[PDB]
Design a protein around this nucleic acid. Structure first.
Lengths: 340, 190, 147, 303, 125, 123
RNA sequence: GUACGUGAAAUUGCUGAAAGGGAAGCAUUGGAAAUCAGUCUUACCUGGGUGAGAUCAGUAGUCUCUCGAGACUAUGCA
RNA sequence: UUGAGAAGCUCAGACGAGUAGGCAGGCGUGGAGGUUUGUGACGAAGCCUUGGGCGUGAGCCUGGGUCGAACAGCCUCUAGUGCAGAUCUUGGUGGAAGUAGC
RNA sequence: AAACUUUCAGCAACGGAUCUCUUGGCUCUCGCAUCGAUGAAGAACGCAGCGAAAUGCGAUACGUAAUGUGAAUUG
């Protein structure tokens, strides 16, 4: 399988791992890599969104760029640079793409929306501290906010859209309005406030204004995955104690029509949204996963045990490698093995 | 139908009784004092009134003769307000003209159920250590493999093997101060 | 095997043992409690004198009818004898007491006998169990000046 | 055989043949090796005794001594840099204790402070938590922060954090001995001691072992000739502080072999949890958690 | 419960007729469950174990190791599978006894006898 | 009321210190030849009803709370109204997990668990 | 480790600490040494301000029971 | 004012050796029915303990170590149900003693 | 003072109790009627590939034939 990697010290590891490759097993074949990139700490990797084939790898010093992996080896296509004032106090917590637009949202509500090819940028300002934002993949130009003591609220550039909007109209600071703001669940079983700390937002509408009744589910640092709705109201439609370690990553498995999650202690486990229970866990991981990317019938978990697994829809471990460094994000390129 | 169900269950055998040594205790969920007394047992006493929490909010459970033969519908319920002076004034207005002994119990089991929530809430908000279990199978394995791994390192021997190598390589000034005058010349010979 | 002595560390010590030794129990003991606490090579020069009647070993506890000798006063004991069979067995053990540090690679000329043990055995006479501990003398480093 | 008397007579005679032909295998071997010591060699080069260190599980993160750049690019720029770079920050230790600790926890908390100069002792009083301690201790020029955590008047665990964001390590002390209990002990002095660290083949071995280099002063006085050891062996971190004196020893080939005298303490740790970031036992992200079921193999090591 | 006066419920009588059964009874006591893919094409819940079957191990420490049965050891009540071998100190390998109730049969060694048992016992080929 | 004991040294059957066949639990002597039965002075004493303790401060620990064997998590619940006159002694065969949940709930009821610290090392 | 599940007592040897002037043994009251436990950890209680909501709404709905009694889902949190 | 297990609660006086003997209440052991939404591989029973606790006592509860598959409280039924002793039965081990002696 | 004796504790021996089991016993019940000159019960000897207080067998000897099951035996 073709899959690209990048660690906290900036360098890019480009792996050609295949099925049956357990690097702990001496009788298995060795990993095939073509490593490059900067070896310094300051250009350390944070995120690897996947434009249709171009990887857009950001960095801690703000060197967000465009890497095309069609060429062997990948060669830098284009490069962006951000001002150092947005690096002084703020830190980068997200980067997502939908309809020729690229956010680079920061940890104080600064929303640097950069266009891909037209390069006309639009910055936005929001409420208190952020920890995760996301774009509605189906309807263009809908944002979701979230952070500690900043519960989920849906700022939207165009509230109606009705199918799509022209790109240059998108994300003007005059038209972004919150069409949804969350309302907390009731008090606890001892009459204590359910403190809110949103850590990740995923839009569940695939697996459950034209095209209303937005459906999404969020995770919390306190360990309670919560689903949501708009037609039902502003309270969460369901609350579960899926784990107790702070939940770090949430996402979809589009081939099972099902939604997984993860945590700090590597309880990466799929979750039945229909039977309201956890169905299966990704076993073998011993260490905090840093990022997980999914594509089709396979997933890749990169963890602070310095490994990259390949699990599937049926949580069967395919490939297991070692990567010599502390990774930060993993991206899957080819679902097929090395011989295809 | 009351002394019948006390000379059977109070003196022969009741499945809730606990033979203590200075007392006897009742394991019923609708006991107001916890003990298996005559004026306390919820089976003999056929008009009763208890207070017992259920998921944060304290309730009041009451029974009568005229619902005794309907075990599903036997106990009714009233939810007691958060204000402690309101709850006492709501026990009395529901338990009116009941004996003074019984209403005494409910108010005492309201003082005792509020102190449980006013404590377990503060107790839950403090940061307190983690009671984790010890395991005899995995502390007899450690003690077994320790002494097998302590003597399997020649702990003292590998210290001195490199200690001279730390000397002989010369990490200290040529003539150091931790060595006597004679055997350093052997290192010069080395 | 789990031995009876807190000493015999891996560092500067070695052990041997001998089980089901068809000798007497009240005769190897008084030998054992004499050789105890001594250096190793001296004990060899010691016990060979017992083999040639040059030195007798005192009989302290099991002193039944042991006639007085002239050399029992080297330790102050009235009665002593020259057992030869029991000290033949100890020589077999102390060879293994050497040849175990000879395989562990110790220093042989600072080697004392640290703990000698003599027990009983399942009767068939009065057989014996013996285990021995030989250890280096645990030297002392001079203190650094002042602070 | 369902009998017991037959079963240990049929075995006594079976063993006494297996104890006979083994001598008959070695007696005929005994005569040809003193005619030809060259067959003695091959066998010795063939049948070396196999031991656990030689029959490990093959773990691919055993870092060879060949310097590969991606290693030294990492650990020259980590948070342990100040105690490894040219600045040579003398680390100032803070040794607190578990809450409401006892007398038998406090006489051990003086034996570690014998090992560690540039180390204060501050008994934990009242209601304060470790995460609030670390941020309150970094602002006063402290580097690491140990916590002795007794229970029922015996010390069982030890956690050290790294300030203000460094990796936090939760060992458990075991086989605890004081300085009085050891036979032939010694007095310690004010000299800053010397370090040795051995057998940390794993990469995680060179993450803990740097956090053990981080507690000691980066250049010690040599007048005291005091040495402190952190010897990993089958994933146990043996701690033994010694005082040495070089003297002639003919057995070891250089002829000069020192003689050690222990000072105390004598404790021995496992490794349970490692958290990048200050140690919060419930609000933390786990760098490495100890699997108490995958350590059954005595040939599997993680340190 | 059992309602026959010609079956025994005592542990004494049942635990004697097991451990001292002859080597023809010791065959049908060593049977294996069929896989979920064979349970629907033969309509048979379980087969007695032959040599040279194609099994997978579900329970035990040898979980999931697939193989073929080398020597069905009817005496000590255990199968012996290919290449699942605990080592020995001397240098040779030893066979690990996997219980015949733990394995799951994935491909039968179909013969004239088995087929004439399959086609009548609830299924077909 | 301050607890008090009329005796602190238990009674010890006669000549159960010399012989190892004779156990130390008390057995009243049965022979009129006995020195002890006739109660000669200098010999050991005997269990009598005189050494009975106060009928209110009986069965009490030196603190003042009587004991109570709690062998599961719903045996400490009865002690909700009796937290100032009973101490929840956990039974011995209770596992080292079911034990750590009685402690966390008895602590909410303010009940003294006497041996909550067993098998439970805290971190 | 086939002297093989657990491995009591008598009984034997070593080590540590004591005691012993032709009797110990035990009982009572205390000294010296060793060591153990005790919740004492902290909790408690009292105003204002800030925020959260619920048993509050000069509030709208569902279900099970019996007008209202509980469980709820909204929306405000006056 | 709640102290109604009326088989409970409460107040006040006198009394206290005890043989043959008479009466009463309890403790413990193996099995049986009922009961504890009973305990148990995160370690049941046992065993050891210079640990703590209760009862006047028979006894019981418990901490630590050991250990490895079962076990207990309550109400009843049942008995091959309690040991210091019988020149007691079987087994094990001592002093006499390395003496008598070959 | 050391030794010796005694006492306490730890360790090592001895020893095989306790605990747990249980292809054994003991007791009650139910069905059935079947040894021998056509050589019985019992005895001796032999027979196994490697067998030794045991089993099976009779020179067709740790058994053949016939049927049935269906691919083992085992150190």
């Amino acid at each position: 399988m073709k899959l690209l990697l990048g660690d906290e010290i900036g360098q890019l590891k480009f792996i050609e791992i295949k099925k049956g490759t357990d690097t702990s097993n001496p009788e298995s074949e060795a990993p095939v890599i073509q490593k490059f990139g900067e070896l310094d700490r300051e250009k350390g990797v944070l995120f690897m969104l996947k434009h249709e084939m171009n990887v857009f790898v950001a960095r801690k010093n703000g060197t967000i760029e465009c890497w095309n992996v069609n060429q062997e080896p990948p060669i830098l296509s284009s490069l962006w640079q951000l001002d150092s004032s947005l690096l002084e106090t703020a830190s980068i917590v997200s980067m997502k793409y939908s309809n020729g637009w690229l956010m680079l949202a920061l940890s104080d509500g600064n929303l640097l929306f950069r266009h891909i090819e037209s390069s006309k940028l639009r910055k936005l300002q929001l409420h208190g501290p952020l920890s995760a934002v996301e774009l509605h993949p189906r309807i263009p130009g809908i944002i979701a906010a979230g952070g500690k003591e900043n519960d989920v609220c849906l700022y939207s550039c165009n509230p109606t859209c009705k199918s799509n909007i022209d790109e240059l109209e998108l994300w003007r600071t005059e038209n972004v309005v919150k069409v949804f703001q969350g309302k907390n669940v009731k008090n606890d079983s001892l009459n204590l406030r359910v403190r809110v700390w949103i850590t990740g937002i995923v839009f569940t509408e695939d697996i459950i204004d034209e095209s209303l009744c937005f459906h999404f589910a969020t995770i919390t640092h306190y360990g309670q995955l919560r689903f949501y709705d708009t037609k039902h109201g502003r309270r969460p439609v369901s609350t579960f104690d899926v784990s107790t370690s702070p939940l770090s990553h949430v996402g979809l498995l589009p081939s099972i029509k099902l939604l997984y999650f993860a945590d700090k202690r590597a309880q990466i486990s799929i979750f039945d949204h229909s039977k309201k229970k956890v169905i299966g866990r990704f076993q073998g991981v011993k260490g905090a996963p840093s990022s997980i990317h999914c594509l089709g019938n396979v997933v890749a978990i990169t963890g602070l045990d310095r490994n990259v697994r390949i699990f599937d829809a049926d949580r069967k471990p395919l490939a297991n490698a070692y990567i010599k460094a502390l990774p930060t994000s993993i991206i899957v390129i080819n679902e097929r093995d090395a011989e295809i | 139908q009351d002394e019948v169900i006390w000379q059977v269950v109070g003196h022969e055998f009741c499945s809730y009784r606990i033979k203590g040594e200075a007392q006897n205790f009742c394991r019923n969920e609708y006991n107001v004092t916890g003990l298996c007394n005559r004026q306390s047992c919820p089976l003999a006493n056929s008009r009763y009134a208890t207070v017992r929490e259920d998921n944060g909010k304290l309730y009041l459970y009451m029974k009568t003769i005229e619902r005794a033969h309907f075990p599903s519908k036997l106990w009714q319920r009233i939810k007691l307000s958060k204000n402690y002076a309101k709850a006492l004034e709501q026990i009395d207005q529901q338990l009116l003209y009941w004996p003074g002994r019984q209403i005494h119990r409910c108010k005492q089991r309201l003082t005792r159920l509020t102190q449980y929530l006013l404590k377990a809430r503060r107790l839950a908000l403090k940061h307190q250590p983690a009671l984790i279990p010890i395991k005899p199978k995995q502390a007899h394995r450690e003690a077994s493999r320790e002494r097998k791994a302590l003597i399997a390192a020649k702990l003292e021997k590998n210290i001195e093997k490199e200690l001279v190598k730390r000397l002989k390589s010369g990490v200290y000034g040529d003539q150091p101060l931790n060595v006597n005058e004679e055997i350093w010349n052997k290192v010069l010979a080395a | 095997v789990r031995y009876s002595a807190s000493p015999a560390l891996e560092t500067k010590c070695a052990k041997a043992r001998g089980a089901y030794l068809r000798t007497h129990f009240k005769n190897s003991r008084e030998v054992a409690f004499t050789i105890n606490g001594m250096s190793l090579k001296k004990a060899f020069i010691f016990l060979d004198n017992v083999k040639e009647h040059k030195q007798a070993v005192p009989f302290r506890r099991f002193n039944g009818g042991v006639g007085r000798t002239a050399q029992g006063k080297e330790f102050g004991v009235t009665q002593a004898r020259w057992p030869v069979k029991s000290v033949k067995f100890f020589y077999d053990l102390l060879k293994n007491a050497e040849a175990n540090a000879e395989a562990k690679g110790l220093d042989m000329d600072k080697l004392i006998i640290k703990h000698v043990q003599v027990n009983a055995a399942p009767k068939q006479s009065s057989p014996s169990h013996i285990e021995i501990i030989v250890a280096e003398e645990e030297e002392a480093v001079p203190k650094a000046n002042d602070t | 055989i369902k009998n017991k008397i037959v079963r240990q007579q049929q075995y006594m005679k079976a063993l006494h043949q297996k104890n006979k032909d083994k001598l008959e295998r070695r007696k005929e071997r005994a005569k040809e090796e003193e005619k030809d010591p060259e067959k003695k060699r091959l066998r010795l080069s063939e049948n070396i005794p196999a031991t656990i260190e030689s029959k490990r599980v093959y773990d691919e993160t055993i870092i060879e001594d060949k310097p590969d750049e991606e290693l030294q690019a990492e650990l020259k720029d980590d948070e342990f840099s100040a105690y490894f770079s040219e600045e040579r920050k003398v680390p100032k230790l803070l040794v607190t204790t578990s809450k409401r600790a006892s007398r038998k926890c406090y006489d051990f908390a003086s034996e570690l402070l014998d090992c560690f100069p540039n180390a204060e002792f501050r008994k934990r009083t009242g209601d304060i938590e470790v995460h609030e301690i670390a941020e309150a201790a970094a602002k006063r020029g402290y580097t690491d922060l140990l916590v002795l955590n007794e229970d029922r008047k015996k010390t069982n665990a030890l956690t050290l954090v790294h300030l203000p964001n460094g990796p936090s390590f939760y060992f458990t002390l075991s086989n605890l001995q004081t300085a009085k209990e050891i036979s032939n002990h010694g007095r310690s002095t004010g000299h800053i001691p010397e370090l040795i660290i051995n057998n940390f083949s794993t990469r995680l071995g060179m993450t803990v072992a740097r956090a053990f280099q981080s507690l000691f002063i980066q250049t010690p006085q040599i007048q005291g000739r005091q040495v402190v050891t952190i010897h990993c062996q089958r994933d146990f971190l043996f701690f033994r502080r010694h005082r040495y004196a070089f003297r002639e020893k003919s057995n070891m080939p250089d002829g000069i072999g020192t003689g050690l005298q222990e000072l105390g303490p004598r404790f021995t740790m496992r490794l349970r949890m490692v958290q990048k970031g200050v140690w919060d036992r419930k609000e933390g992200e786990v760098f490495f958690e100890s699997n108490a079921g995958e350590e059954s193999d005595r040939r599997k090591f993680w340190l | 419960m059992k309602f026959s006066r010609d079956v025994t419920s005592s542990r004494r009588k049942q635990r004697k007729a097991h451990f001292g059964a002859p080597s023809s009874v010791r065959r049908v006591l060593m049977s294996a469950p069929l896989s979920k893919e064979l349970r629907e094409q033969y309509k048979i819940r379980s087969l007695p174990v032959r040599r040279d079957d194609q099994i997978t191990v579900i329970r035990g420490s040898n979980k999931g190791r697939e193989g073929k049965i080398t020597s069905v050891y009817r005496k000590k009540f255990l199968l012996l599978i290919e290449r699942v071998t605990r080592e020995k100190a001397n240098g040779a390998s030893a066979p690990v006894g996997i219980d015949a109730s733990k394995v799951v049969i994935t491909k039968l060694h179909l013969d004239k006898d088995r087929k004439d048992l399959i086609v009548r016992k609830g299924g077909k080929v | 009321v301050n607890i008090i004991k009329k005796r602190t040294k238990p009674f010890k059957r006669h000549q159960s210190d010399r012989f190892k066949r004779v156990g130390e639990s008390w057995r009243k002597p049965r022979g009129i030849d006995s020195c002890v039965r006739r109660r000669f002075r200098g010999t050991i004493s005997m269990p009598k009803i005189g050494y009975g303790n106060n009928k209110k401060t009986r069965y009490c620990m030196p603190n003042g709370l009587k004991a109570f064997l709690v062998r599961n998590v719903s045996d400490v619940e009865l002690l909700l109204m009796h937290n100032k006159t009973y101490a929840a002694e956990i039974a011995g065969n209770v596992s080292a997990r079911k034990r750590v949940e009685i402690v966390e709930k008895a602590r909410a009821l303010g009940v003294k668990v006497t041996n909550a610290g067993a098998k439970v090392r805290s971190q």
